[PDB]
């Protein structure tokens, strides 16, 4: 359980335990006054590295809830094929809508 109003509560497990939708609400409904009695031991800028790693992993969560909605990531570029001595490799310009009915 993280609490945003203090520096030394946020860890890597505390960001990823809440998803993308819930992190919209709890950060928009947090405390204005920042406490400073016991800061983050790696400095107050060290936890900036600690939170935001959980965001790009939080759409890998939303990638799984939409794995039944989006498509498998095809290689966007060439050079990525198991056989290159008889057939070439394309790469899909992913202009398409990842969308499964």
């Amino acid at each position: 359980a993280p609490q945003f109003h203090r520096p030394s509560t946020i860890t890597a497990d505390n960001v990823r335990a809440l998803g993308t939708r819930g992190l919209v609400l709890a950060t928009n409904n947090a405390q204005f006054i920042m406490d400073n009695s016991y800061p983050h031991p790696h400095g107050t800028q060290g936890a900036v590295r600690e939170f935001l790693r959980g965001q790009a992993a939080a759409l890998t969560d939303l990638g799984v809830t939409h794995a039944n909605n989006t498509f498998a990531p095809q290689p966007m570029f060439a050079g990525d094929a198991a056989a290159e001595w008889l057939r070439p490799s394309f790469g899909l310009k992913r202009t398409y809508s990842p969308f499964v009915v």
Binding site: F71, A81, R87, F90, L92, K93, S97, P98, V100, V101
Partner: protein, 49 residues
């Protein structure tokens, strides 16, 4: 020639018309359900024709 005879052709339903739109109809061969890596009907969609 190895990627001209390389495409995804779905079988038409019995009693259904021809697919005309790649965006909506999933039986269309240029639909995003059919756009596989390393193929030419997706290269019909990478270069949009």
């Amino acid at each position: 020639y190895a990627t001209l005879q390389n495409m995804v052709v779905p079988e038409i339903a019995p009693g259904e018309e021809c697919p005309s739109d790649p965006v909506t109809d999933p039986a269309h061969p240029l639909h995003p359900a059919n756009l596989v890596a390393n193929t030419v009907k997706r290269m019909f969609h990478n270069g949009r024709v």
